[PDB]
Amino acid sequence: VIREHNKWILKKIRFQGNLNTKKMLNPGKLSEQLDREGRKRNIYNHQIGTIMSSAGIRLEKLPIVRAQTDTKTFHEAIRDKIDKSENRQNPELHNKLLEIFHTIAQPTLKHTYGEVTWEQLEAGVNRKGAAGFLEKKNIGEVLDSEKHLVEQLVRDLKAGRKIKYYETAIPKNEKRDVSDDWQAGDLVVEKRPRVIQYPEAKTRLAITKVMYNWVKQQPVVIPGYEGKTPLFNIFDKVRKEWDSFNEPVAVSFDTKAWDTQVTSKDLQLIGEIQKYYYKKEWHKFIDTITDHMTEVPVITADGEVYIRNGQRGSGQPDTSAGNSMLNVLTMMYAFCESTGVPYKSFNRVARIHVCGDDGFLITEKGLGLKFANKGMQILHEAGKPQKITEGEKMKVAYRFEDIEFCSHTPVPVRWSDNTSSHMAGRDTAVILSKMATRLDSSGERGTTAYEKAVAFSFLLMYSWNPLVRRICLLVLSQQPETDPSKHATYYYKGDPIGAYKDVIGRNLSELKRTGFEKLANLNLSLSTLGVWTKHTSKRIIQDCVAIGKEEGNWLVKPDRLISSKTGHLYIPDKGFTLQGKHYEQLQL
Numbered sequence: 265v266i267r268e269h270n271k272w273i274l275k276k277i278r279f280q281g282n283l284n285t286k287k288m289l290n291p292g293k294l295s296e297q298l299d300r301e302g303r304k305r306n307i308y309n310h311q312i313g314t315i316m317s318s319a320g321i322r323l324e325k326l327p328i329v330r331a332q333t334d335t336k337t338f339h340e341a342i343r344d345k346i347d348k349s350e351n352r353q354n355p356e357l358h359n360k361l362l363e364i365f366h367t368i369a370q371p372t373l374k375h376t377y378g379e380v381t382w383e384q385l386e387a388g389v390n391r392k393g394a395a396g397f398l399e400k401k402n403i404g405e406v407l408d409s410e411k412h413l414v415e416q417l418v419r420d421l422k423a424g425r426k427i428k429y430y431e432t433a434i435p436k437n438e439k440r441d442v443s444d445d446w447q448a449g450d451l452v453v454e455k456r457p458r459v460i461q462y463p464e465a466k467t468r469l470a471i472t473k474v475m476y477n478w479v480k481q482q483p484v485v486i487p488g489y490e491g492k493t494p495l496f497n498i499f500d501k502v503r504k505e506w507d508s509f510n511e512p513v514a515v516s517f518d519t520k521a522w523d524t525q526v527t528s529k530d531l532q533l534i535g536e537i538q539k540y541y542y543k544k545e546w547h548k549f550i551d552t553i554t555d556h557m558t559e560v561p562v563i564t565a566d567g568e569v570y571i572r573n574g575q576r577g578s579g580q581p582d583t584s585a586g587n588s589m590l591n592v593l594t595m596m597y598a599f600c601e602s603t604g605v606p607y608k609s610f611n612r613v614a615r616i617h618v619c620g621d622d623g624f625l626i627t628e629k630g631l632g633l634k635f636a637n638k639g640m641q642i643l644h645e646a647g648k649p650q651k652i653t654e655g656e657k658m659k660v661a662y663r664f665e666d667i668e669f670c671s672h673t674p675v676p677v678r679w680s681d682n683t684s685s686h687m688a689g690r691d692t693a694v695i696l697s698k699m700a701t702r703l704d705s706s707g708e709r710g711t712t713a714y715e716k717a718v719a720f721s722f723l724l725m726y727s728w729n730p731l732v733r734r735i736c737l738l739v740l741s742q743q744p745e746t747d748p749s750k751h752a753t754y755y756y757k758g759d760p761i762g763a764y765k766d767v768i769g770r771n772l773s774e775l776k777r778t779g780f781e782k783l784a785n786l787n788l789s790l791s792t793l794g795v796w797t798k799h800t801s802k803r804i805i806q807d808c809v810a811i812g813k814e815e816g817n818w819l820v821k822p823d824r825l826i827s828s829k830t831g832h833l834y835i836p837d838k839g840f841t842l843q844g845k846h847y848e849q850l851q852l
C-alpha cells in the first residue's frame with residue numbers, strides 16, 4: 265500500500281518488475297531507459313512492441329539480455345578463451361588437408377585473382393567500421409581522406425615490407441539470446457561478452473582491397489559455403505540432397521570456440537590456398553600478411569597487451585572465407601578418415617554445407633554414424649575439439665526437420681497448389697525477441713519507416729510463423745505513403761507483398777499450411793517462459809480482421825485465415841526485394 269501522492273508513478277509501469285526486492289515494493293519497470301551518456305531511449309521497437317503488448321505478450325519475458333561490456337568480466341573472457349597454447353595437431357594433417365583442397369580446386373581460376381577498384385571495395389561497406397587502438401580515423405573517414413595512405417600499405421605489403429601489425433580487442437556490445445538458459449532454471453540477467461579482435465581500418469581496407477575476391481568469396485570457391493546464401497531458401501536446396509539418399513542422416517559440426525582453435529599452420533594452409541587463386545604478383549602480399557597473423561600483438565580496450573599465438577581474430581577480413589575453407593577441409597578430412605572414403609570420392613557419398621565454423625554434412629546412415637563416432641577423436645587430434653556431449657558422439661539427425669544450421673531448422677510448408685517446400689525455422693520466442701529488441705542504430709530514434717523494413721525483413725524469413733507473420737502484416741499496414749528504411753536486413757520497393765513474391769517465388773496468400781508438429785514444437789517455449797497468453801493468437805487475429813474487414817484491398821488479407829474471416833483477398837501490385845547496409849552481399 266503506497267501513499268496517494270505517489271500512485272501517479274504507477275500510470276507509467278509497462279512491465280513487471282525485475283528488482284526482486286524483498287522488503288520494499290517494486291511496482292514495475294518503465295518503457296524507457298537511460299543512455300550510457302544520460303539520454304533516455306527506448307528499450308524495444310515501439311510499433312512492434314505495442315502490437316505485441318496488445319495480445320498478452322509480455323516483452324519482459326522474452327529470452328533476451330545484454331552482454332557485459334564491463335572490463336572485469338571482459339578480461340575473464342580473454343583469460344577463459346583466448347589465453348591458450350596452440351592445439352597439438354597430427355603431422356601430415358596440413359599436407360593431407362592441402363591434398364583435399366586440390367581435389368576441389370578450380371583451375372579455371374588458378375592464379376587469376378587480383379586487386380580491386382575502390383569502386384567495388386566501397387560497395388556496401390560499413391563506414392562506422394572500428395578504428396583501432398592506435399588509429400585516429402575509422403573506415404569512411406579513412407576512405408574520405410587517408411585513401412592514399414591505404415595505397416602505400418598495399419605497396420609496402422606487396423613488396424613484403426615492414427608493417428607494425430596489431431589488433432585491438434574490445435568486448436562486443438550486443439543483446440544475446442538466453443532462451444536455453446531461461447528454459448532451465450538459470451534466469452541469467454546478462455551474458456559474458458565476446459572478444460572482438462581486429463586490424464586497424466587501414467590495414468583492413470588494404471587487405472580487403474586486394475583480396476576482395478577470396479575474402480568476399482565472390483566466385484564462391486569453397487565447397488558448400490552457404491555464406492552469401494539468403495536463409496529463406498537454403499533448406500529447399502538442402503532438402504534436395506536429403507531426398508537423394510536411401511537412408512539419410514545429417515551430422516553437425518560443433519567445434520568448441522573455433523577461432524580459439526586455429527593454429528599457425530592452419531593459417532599457413534589458407535595462405536597457400538590463397539596463393540593458388542591469386543596471381544603470382546600478390547603471393548608476397550599474402551605471405552607477408554599471413555606471417556604476421558601467426559603471432560599478433562593485441563591491445564585490449566583498457567590498455568593491457570598480450571601476444572596472441574595466432575588463433576583467428578573475428579575482425580580479420582579473412583574470417584568468413586578462411587574459417588569456412590578451413591572448416592570444410594577439416595570436416596571432409598575427418599569424415600574420410602572415419603569412414604575410409606577416399607578424399608577424391610567425398611562428393612560421391614556426401615554433401616556438405618559450411619558457414620564459418622557452423623555447418624553439417626549429409627550421408628547415408630552407415631557412413632554418417634561411423635563419422636559421428638570416430639569423428640570425435642579424429643577431429644580432436646586434428647586441433648578442432650568438438651563440444652563435449654552426453655552422447656559421446658557428434659550430433660546426428662535422422663529426420664530432415666532435425667537438421668540445425670545457422671540457428672535454424674527446416675519448417676515444412678504446404679502451398680495452395682498442393683506442393684511443399686521448407687523454410688527457415690527457429691523458436692518463436694526467439695524470433696519475437698529479436699524482432700522486438702532489434703533497434704536500428706543508423707543511430708536514429710527510428711521511424712515507422714524502419715519498423716516496416718524490419719517487419720518486411722522478418723516476413724521474408726518467417727512467413728511460416730502465423731503469429732509473427734500477422735504481426736508483420738499489421739506493422740506493414742501502417743503509414744502506406746512512407747517508404748521503408750534501408751537500415752534493416754532487407755527492404756522493399758513497390759508492394760511488400762509483391763516483393764515477397766519476388767524472392768520467395770510464391771505469393772504470401774498461397775501459403776496454405778505449416779507443418780503442424782514442427783510449428784507446434786517451435787511454439788512450446790512461448791508457454792514455458794510465459795511469453796504469451798492463451799488469447800494472444802486470437803487477439804492478433806482480431807487485430808488483423810478489424811483492419812481488413814471493410815471493402816478495400818488490404819495487405820493483411822494475404823494471410824489466408826484473415827482473408828477467409830473478412831471474406832476479402834489481397835491483390836498485390838508489383839514489388840521488389842533488396843538488401844540494406846550489408847555484411848556479406850547475399851546473391852538474391
Ligand SMILES: Nc1nc2c(ncn2[C@@H]2O[C@H](COP(=O)(O)OP(=O)(O)OP(=O)(O)O)[C@@H](O)[C@H]2O)c(=O)[nH]1
Nearest residue numbers: 438439490493494495496498619670671698702850
Ligand atoms: N543463410 C543465412 N544465414 C544468415 C543470414 N544472415 C545471418 N545468418 C546467420 O543467422 C544466424 C542468426 O542471426 P540472427 O539472430 O538472425 O541475426 P544477428 O544480427 O546475427 O543477431 P542479433 O543482431 O544479435 O539479433 C547468424 O549467426 C548467422 O550465422 C543470411 O542472409 N542467410
